[PDB]
Design a protein around this nucleic acid. Structure first.
Lengths: 278, 278
RNA sequence: UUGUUGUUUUUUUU
């Protein structure tokens, strides 16, 4: 029922492979303060960092369980102020790893606590928030590995696959099978719903931009971006001109863009802002 | 243990999508007398035809069970007529014949074929299908009559490709036997080409204008190993970059292999070269 | 509709 603004990507990079700028599986994507694009390249067991234009800068990590090694890294997040890179690993490892902006290993934790990490983010106080699929848990860490909060949401979540937070201790979780974003507080109380069936079907990720606006991305037919206020009011809706392979994850860039990681081993950058027409 | 000549592809085309020159799943590839590249685009329920340089010419077929395609997975060309032989995988599991213009001619074999996994045509116009799981070879005439039929569960573990010479010898690539197995039309096992160490996990087989046997695999890099029909090794190549899972391969008379891959792209590798100056 | 492999892992839907 919504007439969506058409959009095309202005940037595309990546391909299959093990060399620099190549992926085996780009399961996770994140963006730092300088709009560098950080990608979890799972089956290469490494993290790759690109600039905002998709040029390879550097990589870190290799297959293993030792320090400075990764085993199936799937999601990434950035500590804004320090530029530290938060990495989650999939089961059987299911733990958090922290690397600094130079790709040096800092620490790892949460291995005995996490089961199926599926989304990760960091609030303005540096607390690390992980959402887990299947078991439907949310776990909040500090950067040294202490558990600050923990709660289940198996009552409200069917398939959680993305998470962000505002500065009011509200957690926005995209739910693939509920066709919407679910909002919680740090205590674990369900607050409200953003989007829903018919406008945000099968969401694959969620973002919060510098305006505090909530972006919900999905690939239900074309690639769609639906933008809301935190109270749930729709303010913008976009749709891609071409169809995309399965989408793993999305991240926001300060220029008003979404970085899209897809199963065709490529990343796409869509602009969701435009000039005001005369 | 074999020192392989390194190679790079000189042509690349295709991407994910439903439009012309886009694929959802390029499961099958074939080449006609004019080196047009014919692609089975399975989940789009269509066949797409490109010229030797990867330019889109035209498409035919749409989803359905009427005299339409439902999950076409392999293709072969009747050289003299330019007819396109199409197999559909289960549940349909039948052969369809289209002419060079993409016009439906006829369909057959629905009640006999179970799991078509490879198809080719001999110089007399007989259509040969190899089936995985059940390990069968079935030879049809162009009206749909079964001329020959035999099981090879004793010699085959995972057949995924087939070609023939003009001597009624059938060359079948076996993914889990790491070689090509040779049979006659009666079903007698004749000999083996390749083996463990040089043709691991073959994904297809070809016979070129010289009667030379090409075995393609993606066990690490993309490899081409070339033999005589008696099994003597004469050439061996390997790609400089790694590829996503490869569905199928076909030969171009200019001395190239067309490679269809799970990254929704086709690659053309040249396996001939200039003689260096001595 | 789908048996490639390329270290275990990966509930998107189309």
């Amino acid at each position: 029922q919504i007439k969506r603004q058409k959009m095309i990507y202005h940037c595309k990079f990546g391909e299959f492979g093990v060399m620099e700028g190549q992926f085996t599986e780009p399961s996770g994507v994140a963006v730092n303060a300088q709009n560098d694009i950080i990608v979890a390249d799972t089956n290469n067991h490494r993290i790759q960092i690109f600039d905002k234009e998709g040029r390879f800068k550097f990589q870190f990590g290799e297959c293993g369980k030792r320090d400075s090694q990764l085993l199936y890294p799937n999601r990434v997040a950035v500590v804004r102020n320090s530029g530290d890179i938060i990495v989650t690993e999939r089961s059987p490892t299911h733990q958090i790893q922290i690397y600094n902006q130079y790709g040096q290993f800092v620490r790892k934790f949460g291995a005995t606590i996490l089961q199926h990490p599926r989304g990760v983010t960091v609030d303005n106080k540096g607390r690390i928030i992980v959402v887990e699929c299947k078991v439907m848990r949310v776990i909040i860490f500090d950067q040294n590995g202490n558990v600050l909060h923990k709660f289940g949401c198996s009552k409200h979540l069917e398939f959680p696959n993305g998470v962000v937070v505002n500065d009011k201790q509200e957690i926005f979780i995209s739910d693939n099978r509920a066709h919407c974003v679910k909002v919680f507080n740090y205590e674990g109380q369900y607050l409200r719903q953003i989007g829903g069936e018919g406008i945000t079907n099968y969401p694959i990720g969620v973002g919060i931009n510098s305006n505090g606006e909530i972006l919900i991305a999905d690939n239900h037919n074309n690639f769609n971006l639906t933008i809301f206020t935190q109270d749930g009011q729709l303010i913008s809706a976009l749709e891609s001109k071409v169809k995309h392979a399965q989408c793993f994850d999305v991240a926001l860039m300060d220029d008003g863009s979404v970085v899209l990681a897809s199963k065709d081993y490529r990343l796409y950058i869509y602009r969701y802002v435009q000039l005001a027409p005369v």
